[PDB]
């Protein structure tokens, strides 16, 4: 009965026979893989290759389950799966010498490690299932010829979202019978969708079973409280008992009869109220709706409940209106990308290719940076969920191994994108990057995924790839001054697109631009366009001062006066930012610093031609 | 009786018989508890802050 | 502000331009002139007097010596 192995390892068939743990559900496609390799004459030692967290432990648990269920074949029939624990461990090799002898003699024990023993593998008398990671599989196992010809690589990947739905349905009985919460069918598919959408650091299905546990308990604990019916009488029971103690030790038995009768009477009414309250609770069903699922995930990432509750139905229809809130002018660029993005999300193109693939051409500081930030907020609801990588530091050839991953043997973009799959990737000065970098960039547009040096494959199907190139801006700014008294803003967008397309491919590869859906070219900022930008900044301060309750209104005369002072078409909106800070913020701060001179009132700023006049009036 | 400790006793929680409320620090919880699969599905971390 | 724009592009020439975006304001230091050093000498004289608080010694230096 291999007594030595029973003291230095943990048996799996004992747990499976007892049934005290949750059986593995959904891993039926991996149990047959393990037994298939074990039946081979050579290379009959499969290795569970994958990142720790996908559920490789459940692979061994499921294998032992087949013995009890009589699903294993005759060859593997009447066998016990044994897993060695590395936490218990020259003198070290003394213990394992007797353990390995019993495995071969018994002939029915299947070794399971999580990595003396290499010569044992060459004999073929031991059937061990390794659990080394992919990074260490090509570093220590592949380098050894003997181990390469004895271990069969087996890939364990994350199961599909639809597959996880069936996993949760299997554990429905164990959850409903425990939390006493009637779990709805619709909540199963909604919870797994939300868990994968936000959380990506745990994969599936560990983030789908613990999500429903807290949501179901949230309504279970809420419905198990006193509805202002029993707590009031419960305190009355305690206080009367205190009165009785004074009717005995004080030798005053005249009041003892009254307190005794009242105490018993209150017990009858308290019990009746408690009994009738639980009868109604049992009749009603406290079902778990999809609303409570979003509440738990709301506090984990900080996303408001309103954003999570969105069904993502009318958001794409009014995309042009949404993007115009933070971007003023250049409406053609807004509509060009709005129609392009809605095709990929629906599924009209290849899902593996990035949803967003556009090239930005125009002057610097004109508002291109502002437009890029609008995509992250309008799509994912998080402004900081935008990974921006600049090519200023990637000019040399030595930076090729930086954004893709450090080579093995030493101490960026691929690592960051994994933690935030739903992010916008922005590139700055792509025209001044090393040519070898474009080889990796092209693979994203065509294949859709990249692999680092450790072998882990990250996904780019939920990322928007935008490369902002400053080339061709000289031609764009020459058209504005080409004609006196007018500009090229009246020209059709198609005419500008064709003229600038030739210059775009002049310095770039021809076939590279073919994968880009639409080319986006910005415009210039005129007098009236900058006036509205000033309005945005003023309203931003008013919204930010909601705590102080300050109503800030700026006259149109002052808007024009401040617009012309910082008017600089070469840069754009950058000079206006300095002008607003040195004119509005300088005096606004002083009023607050003067013992909150303005509070719950209306402040108007008007320009009389020479200076700015401030008027203080009630709201 | 509600057991209370401040991380042998590994089988005591494998069967789900004892109810221990640990008080070990985060550093030790990731040292000899998280690396052990036996104790991974037995202790539920509770985040307590200032 | 005029000198700020000329040096702002130089600062992002070597570093990441995105890094300067997160920075609120950029401060550029000037160079000291002849008369600016004269008032600095006056600052140091008061520091010495503050040092000799227990001795209560009053230190006075003429501007002729300060400029010399």
Residue A232 to residues A226, A237, A239, A243, A269, Cα–Cα distance (Å): 10, 9, 11, 18, 12
- Exposure of A261 by Cβ count < 10 A (0-12 exposed, 13-18 middle, 19+ buried)? exposed
Q: Round to the nearest angstrom and report the end-to-end CA distance of chain B.
A: 29
**Which 8-state DSSP code applies to residue A401?**
T
**Which 8-state DSSP code applies to residue A467?**
E
Q: Round to the nearest angstrom and report the end-to-end CA distance of chain C.
A: 36
Residues in Cβ contact with A536 at an 8 Å cutoff, skipping those fewer than 6 apart: A326, A328
Nearest 5°: the CA angle A495, A497, A499 is: 70
> Quick check: A551 and A602 in contact, CB under 8 A?
yes
Shortest Cα–Cα distance, B35 to chain A (Å): 8
Q: What gap in Å lies between CA A491 and CA A500, rounded to an integer?
A: 13
Residues in Cβ contact with A160 at an 8 Å cutoff, skipping those fewer than 6 apart: none
Please give the helix or strand (H or E) that residue A268 lies within, else none. helix A256-283
- Looking at the partner chain, which of B15, B32, B38 has a beta carbon nearest the beta carbon of A10? B38
Shortest Cα–Cα distance, A155 to chain C (Å): 40
Q: Round to the nearest angstrom and report the end-to-end CA distance of chain A.
A: 88
**Which 8-state DSSP code applies to residue A206?**
H
Q: Which residue in chain A has the smallest CA separation from B36?
A: A87
Residues in Cβ contact with A331 at an 8 Å cutoff, skipping those fewer than 6 apart: A320, A324
C-alpha neighbours within 13 Å on the C-beta side of residue A568: 16
Between chain A and chain B, the number of residue pairs with CB atoms below 8 A apart is 11
Among candidate residues A582, A531, A566, the one with its CA nearest the CA of residue A365: A566
Please give the helix or strand (H or E) that residue A5 lies within, else none. helix A3-7
Q: What gap in Å lies between CA C41 and CA A60, rounded to an integer?
A: 81
The pair of structure tokens assigned to A297 is 């995930």
Q: Which residue in chain C has the smallest CA separation from A432?
A: C13
Q: Report DSSP letters for B6-45, one per residue.
A: ----HHHHHTT---EE----HHHHTTTTTT-HHHHTT---
- Exposure of A248 by Cβ count < 10 A (0-12 exposed, 13-18 middle, 19+ buried)? exposed
Shortest Cα–Cα distance, A393 to chain C (Å): 7
- Exposure of A1 by Cβ count < 10 A (0-12 exposed, 13-18 middle, 19+ buried)? exposed
Cis peptide before A541 (omega within 30 of 0): no
Place of tokens 């009414």: A269
The pair of structure tokens assigned to A515 is 């994968």
- Tell whether C39 is within 8 A of chain A (Cβ): no
C-alpha neighbours within 13 Å on the C-beta side of residue A251: 0
Q: Report DSSP letters for A24-93, one per residue.
A: P-S-HHHHHHHHHHHTSSSS--EEEES-TTSSSHHHHHHHHHHHHTT-S-STT-S-EEEEE-GGG--HHH
Chain A residues near residue C14 by CB distance under 8 angstroms: 392
> Quick check: A22 and A163 in contact, CB under 8 A?
no
Phi first, then psi: give them for residue A243, nearest 5 degrees. -65, -40
Task: Indicate yes or no: CB of A392 within 8 angstroms of CB of C13.
Answer: yes
C36: left (phi over 0), alpha (psi -120 to 50) or beta: alpha
Detail the DSSP E strand segments found in A97-216. Answer: 109-112, 128-129, 152-155
Q: What gap in Å lies between CA A482 and CA A598, rounded to an integer?
A: 50
Chains contacting A (3 or more CB pairs within 8 Å): B, C
- Tell whether C18 is within 8 A of chain A (Cβ): yes
State the helix-helix crossing angle for A57-68 and A28-38, rounded to 10 degrees.
80
Query: What b/e string do you get for A526-535 counting C-beta neighbours within 10 Å, with b at 16 or more?
Result: eeebbbebbe
Please give the helix or strand (H or E) that residue A568 lies within, else none. none
Q: What gap in Å lies between CA A96 and CA A29, rounded to an integer?
A: 33
Give the residue before each break in chain C, using a C-to-N cut-off of over 2.5 angstroms; say none if it is continuous. Answer: none
Task: Indicate yes or no: CB of C5 within 8 angstroms of CB of A571.
Answer: yes
- Exposure of A192 by Cβ count < 10 A (0-12 exposed, 13-18 middle, 19+ buried)? buried
Q: Which sign does the torsion angle of CA C5, C9, C12, C18 carry? A: positive
Residues in Cβ contact with A14 at an 8 Å cutoff, skipping those fewer than 6 apart: none
> Quick check: A443 and A351 in contact, CB under 8 A?
no
Place of tokens 């065509």: A446
| A52 annotated as belonging to a binding site for a ligand | yes
| A362 annotated as belonging to a binding site for a ligand | yes
Place of tokens 């023993």: A117
- Looking at the partner chain, which of B32, B35, B37 has a beta carbon nearest the beta carbon of A57? B37
C-alpha neighbours within 13 Å on the C-beta side of residue A301: 24
Q: What gap in Å lies between CA A577 and CA C25, rounded to an integer?
A: 11
- Looking at the partner chain, which of A369, A390, A571 has a beta carbon nearest the beta carbon of C16? A390
**Which 8-state DSSP code applies to residue A581?**
I
Q: What gap in Å lies between CA A165 and CA A162, rounded to an integer?
A: 5
- Exposure of A345 by Cβ count < 10 A (0-12 exposed, 13-18 middle, 19+ buried)? middle
The pair of structure tokens assigned to A300 is 């984990």
Place of tokens 């994108």: A417
Percentages of chain A per state (helix, strand, coil), in multiples of 5: 50, 10, 35
- Tell whether C12 is within 8 A of chain A (Cβ): yes
Place of tokens 């408001």: A304
Q: Starting at the edge strand that comes first in sequence, how are the strands of the sheet with A551-554 ordered?
A: A551-554, A601-607, A612-618
Residue C52 to residues C42, C45, C58, C59, C63, Cα–Cα distance (Å): 16, 11, 8, 9, 21
Residues in Cβ contact with A77 at an 8 Å cutoff, skipping those fewer than 6 apart: A67
| CB within 8 Å of chain C, chain A residues 77-116 | none
The pair of structure tokens assigned to A144 is 């050894």
Pairing of β A601-607 and β A551-554: parallel
Task: Indicate yes or no: CB of A87 within 8 angstroms of CB of B15.
Answer: no
Q: Which parts of A420-555 fold into alpha helices (H)?
A: 437-446, 473-480, 493-506, 527-544
- Tell whether A214 is within 8 A of chain B (Cβ): no
Among candidate residues A53, A65, A35, A45, the one with its CA nearest the CA of residue B37: A53
Detail the DSSP E strand segments found in A302-419. Answer: 356-361, 386-390
- Tell whether B16 is within 8 A of chain A (Cβ): yes
Q: What gap in Å lies between CA A488 and CA A594, rounded to an integer?
A: 50
Please give the helix or strand (H or E) that residue A213 lies within, else none. helix A206-223
Q: What gap in Å lies between CA A66 and CA A16, rounded to an integer?
A: 9
Chain B residues near residue A87 by CB distance under 8 angstroms: 32, 35-36
């Amino acid at each position: 009965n291999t007594p030595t192995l029973d003291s230095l390892a943990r048996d799996l068939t004992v747990i499976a026979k007892d049934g005290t743990l949750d059986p593995v559900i959904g891993r039926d496609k991996e149990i047959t893989r393990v037994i298939e390799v074990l039946s081979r004459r050579t290379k009959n030692n499969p290795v569970l290759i994958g990142e720790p967290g996908v559920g490789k432990t459940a692979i061994a648990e499921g294998l032992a389950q087949a013995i009890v269920n009589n699903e294993v074949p005759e060859t593997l029939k009447d066998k016990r799966v044994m897993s060695l624990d590395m936490g218990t461990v020259g003198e070290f090799e003394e213990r394992l010498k007797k353990v390995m002898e019993e495995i071969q003699q018994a002939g029915n024990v299947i070794l399971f490690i999580d990595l003396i023993l290499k010569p044992a593998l060459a004999r073929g008398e031991l059937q061990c299932i390794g659990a080394t990671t992919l990074d260490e599989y090509r570093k220590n196992i592949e380098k050894d010829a003997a181990l390469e010809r004895r271990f069969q690589p087996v890939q364990v990947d994350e199961p599909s979202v639809v597959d996880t739905v069936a996993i949760l349905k299997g554990l429905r009985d164990r959850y409903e019978a425990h939390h006493r919460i009637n779990i709805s069918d619709e909540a199963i598919e909604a919870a797994v969708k939300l868990s994968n959408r936000y959380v990506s650091d745990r994969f599936l299905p560990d983030k789908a079973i613990d999500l429903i546990d807290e949501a179901s308990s949230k309504v279970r604990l809420k419905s198990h409280t006193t509805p202002n019916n029993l707590k009031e009488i419960e305190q009355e029971i305690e206080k009367v008992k205190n009165e009785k103690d004074a009717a005995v030790h004080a030798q005053e038995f005249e009041n003892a009869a009254n307190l005794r009768d009242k105490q018993t009477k209150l017990e009858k009414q308290y019990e009746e109220a408690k009994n009738e309250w639980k009868n109604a609770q049992n009749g009603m069903s406290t079902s778990l709706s999809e609303e409570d699922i979003a509440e738990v995930i709301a506090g984990w990432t900080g996303i408001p409940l309103t954003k999570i509750n969105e069904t993502e139905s009318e958001k794409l229809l009014s995309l042009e209106d949404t993007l115009h809130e933070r971007v003023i002018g250049q409406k053609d660029a807004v509509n060009s990308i709005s129609k392009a993005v809605r095709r990929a999300r629906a599924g009209l193109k290849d899902p593996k290719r990035p949803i967003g693939s556009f090239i930005f051409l125009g002057p610097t500081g004109v508002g291109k940076t502002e437009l890029a930030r609008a995509l992250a907020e309008s799509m994912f609801g998080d402004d900081d969920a935008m990974i921006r990588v600049d090519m200023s530091e990637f000019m040399e050839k030595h930076a090729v191994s930086r954004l893709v991953g450090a080579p093995p043997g030493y101490v960026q973009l691929t690592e960051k994108v994994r933690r935030k799959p739903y992010s916008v990737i922005l590139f700055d000065e792509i025209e001044k990057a090393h040519p070898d970098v474009f080889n990796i960039l092209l693979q994203v547009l065509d294949d859709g995924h990249l692999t680092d040096t450790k072998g882990r494959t990250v996904d780019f199907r939920n990322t928007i790839i935008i490369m902002t190139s400053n080339v061709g801006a000289q031609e764009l700014q020459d058209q504005r001054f080409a004609g006196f008294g007018g500009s090229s803003d009246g020209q059709d967008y198609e005419t500008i697109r064709k003229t600038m397309l030739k210059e775009l491919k002049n310095s770039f590869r021809p076939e590279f631009l073919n994968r880009v859906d639409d080319i986006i070219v910005f415009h210039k900022l005129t007098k009236e366009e900058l006036k509205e930008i000033v309005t945005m900044m003023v309203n931003k301060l008013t919204n930010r001062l909601s705590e102080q309750n300050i109503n800030i209104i700026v006259t149109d005369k002052a808007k024009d006066k401040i617009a012309e002072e910082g008017y600089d078409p070469e840069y754009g909106a950058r000079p206006l930012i300095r002008a607003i800070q040195k004119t509005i913020e300088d005096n606004l701060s002083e009023l607050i610093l003067d013992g909150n001179q303005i509070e719950g009132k209306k402040v108007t700023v008007d320009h009389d031609g020479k200076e700015f006049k401030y008027d203080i009036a009630e709201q």
